[model samples]
Target chain A: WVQPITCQKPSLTLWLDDKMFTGLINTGADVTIIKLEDWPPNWPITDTLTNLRQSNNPKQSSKYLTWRDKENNSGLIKPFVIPNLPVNLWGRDLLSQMKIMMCSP
Target chain B: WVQPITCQKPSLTLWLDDKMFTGLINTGADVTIIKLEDWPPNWPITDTLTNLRNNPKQSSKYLTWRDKENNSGLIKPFVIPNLPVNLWGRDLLSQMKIMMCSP
Candidate 1:
């Protein structure tokens, strides 16, 4: 018999506003966005982002950020917030901080 | 001059509990998980999953799901109520009828 387990992916465990989260490593994205539903209750938005738009829409949509990742070993980032985002993303902003090597199986 | 745009990933726009969500598709994952915070209000949990764990203790850790998919054209998802991130696993795609022919 086969046992069931949570399927694991290459991900990063990081903290936002002292809250922990597992972010999937994505080399395809340029900026990181946590699912809007995943944004913590107490993490306040520091600024509003405008003029940015998603592929499905051209309307000037916006996002917010409270912090940014500044260290390599700390697993912390300057917080940016967006409502309705679908996934926790490890984007270029965070990936650029460290070196990466990719291989195929 | 460079303009900033939302970096678009190969994602899917699907409905869950009548709400719309954009889901990132990951071939590397085995099952679909919606962030706990994203879990909808009034969407009743039909079941609880155990023995599952995440790399980080994002929140009270247990995955949950609606009792049924209701044929919403999408399958019911496991809830990582505080998943800290959102993703649509490859398993979700496997559930759907798909055909791929490559050269």
Candidate 2:
């Protein structure tokens, strides 16, 4: 569910090459960000300097990783990696695929 | 009349006791935050800072307010002294019944 009842942040275990980590589902975030610690070891990085915010330097840009859902569906997602992030976030770009449900008052 | 749309930052003018201000709909935020500058001129503050983002010396405090509607709900927002914008977080957003995108 989308935490339609409380202020609790809605999150889920996101897929990575080797680790399954918590991914915060946030419409407030413009782009997806994965913590630097969880990023694939020895992976090549491109120093993309656009669309960065809040976080200080030592940021790495996009790299596509496969995501597999319970439906056995798989797709490529390019999430940026940043240091000092509290958690991974699934940002505006990937929310549509989640088909999230919402209720109106 | 529901369908996919292009990129846009959706926001709405929300009502407070003495003022109506812009509130950004943020599903990412866990709590609603109102700019201290926009808070009702002389409201009281309560130090009920339960969720701190685990941040130290959290400067914000709670300032309770209400809606103009008959079916009004108590909106207790964190009044950040220098917060530039108001985030319509999940807490009050659930009460507003505002929904995001659709297919």
Candidate 3:
């Protein structure tokens, strides 16, 4: 289906660990960022470095969005994290999952 | 024709005073802003307040993007100065006089 371009901020509801939250789409961003407080208190945790080369630095360590399914199957989504972000952003990497197109005048 | 939504910032080229400039389309912005340095040295100038009611504040005054063209002639737009980049605000749709649809 064809969609017209708009100036309004585009957003959609996302399912995280079966919970729902609003996410803003930012074409200008390189990475997806989730609010630190939005993480579930009882979720599984895995420590990772922001930069893989700096794996030994504690200051560069970050948490992954680790979770389990209803059947007890575990999953790990890579390079995702909680930064000092102002909003939940669906960035470039994820935008590739859906084919996006531009309109011609 | 169907076009996909993109994560890449959308931009276009516009003609101002017969000069070309790259303009970023920002969905989140409410008003279009142009860098003060981008204005041509010889272009005509008009003063405008950010809030029309606050007419006394010269500091909040902006330059109007007044120009004409072969098709859409005699257009005057409010342009905020000292911006970091040239941007096309969503409000620009109002002046376009065209219909836009989305799915």
Candidate 4:
């Protein structure tokens, strides 16, 4: 049940160059992208922002084959059968590898 | 007055390889992504599908600096004024140039 938590702190202060600061201001609440870990219940904010990587499903081949067969009329199932849902949400294990912060004003 | 159209042609045909076909079915309706161009007022579809490029905002600096001075005690018109909105929607001119037919 992991969710993206957005903070509503308006006074959060951030110090960067005028241009970057302006960019940050336009971005509104700085999106502190983090990957919260569970093992020890730690909340360490990561410095790097590489948590948004795309991944493939383990059962992709089997699922693809099943749907392929069903859709193409090549399987026992009748043609025009709607395929089941596909997995698409990013996992928390991936999230626990990063952090997101909002410097206060 | 503009919007994305959805078709209900359940029997609409698509002919990619078995692998690509399965992928399409899993993802649902073959997204016939279109980029309607102006003046064409016509519905002739383009064949070379390679649009969707990011473009620079024609008016960014004016808005950014306006906010910077307001927030940093740097501007003279009283401190911390919220900057006006900055634009960020992807343009459709780029979309019209693309033609994603079911491969």
Candidate 4, residue B72: lDDT:
15
**In model 1, what lDDT does residue A56 have?**
34
Candidate 4, DockQ score (0 to 1): 0.02
> What TM-score does candidate 2 get on C-alpha atoms?
0.70
Task: Arrange candidates, best lDDT first.
Answer: 2, 1, 3, 4
lDDT score of model 3? 0.46
Per-candidate alpha-carbon RMSD to the true structure: 14.0, 4.4, 8.5, 22.9
lDDT of 2 by residue, A29-49 (tens): 556788888777687667665
DockQ for all models, in order? 0.05, 0.34, 0.18, 0.02
On residues B1-103, what C-alpha lDDT tens digit does candidate 2 reach at each position?
1222113444656566545778766777867777777766556655653765533122233333344453346566676775546777787766665554332
Report the error of model 1 at residue B103, Å: 37
Estimate the overall C-alpha local distance difference test score of candidate 2: 0.60
Q: How close is candidate 4 to the true structure, as a TM-score?
A: 0.15
Superior by DockQ: candidate 2 or candidate 4: 2
Per-residue lDDT value at A32 in model 1: 63
Q: What clash pairs does model 3 have?
A: A4-B101, A27-B7, A100-B4, A101-B4
Ten contiguous residues minimizing lDDT sum, candidate 3 chain B = B52-61
Where does model 1 exceed 4 Å of error? A1-9, A50-72, B1-103
lDDT of 1 by residue, A42-93 (tens): 5555554433323332211133332323342443344355555555776655
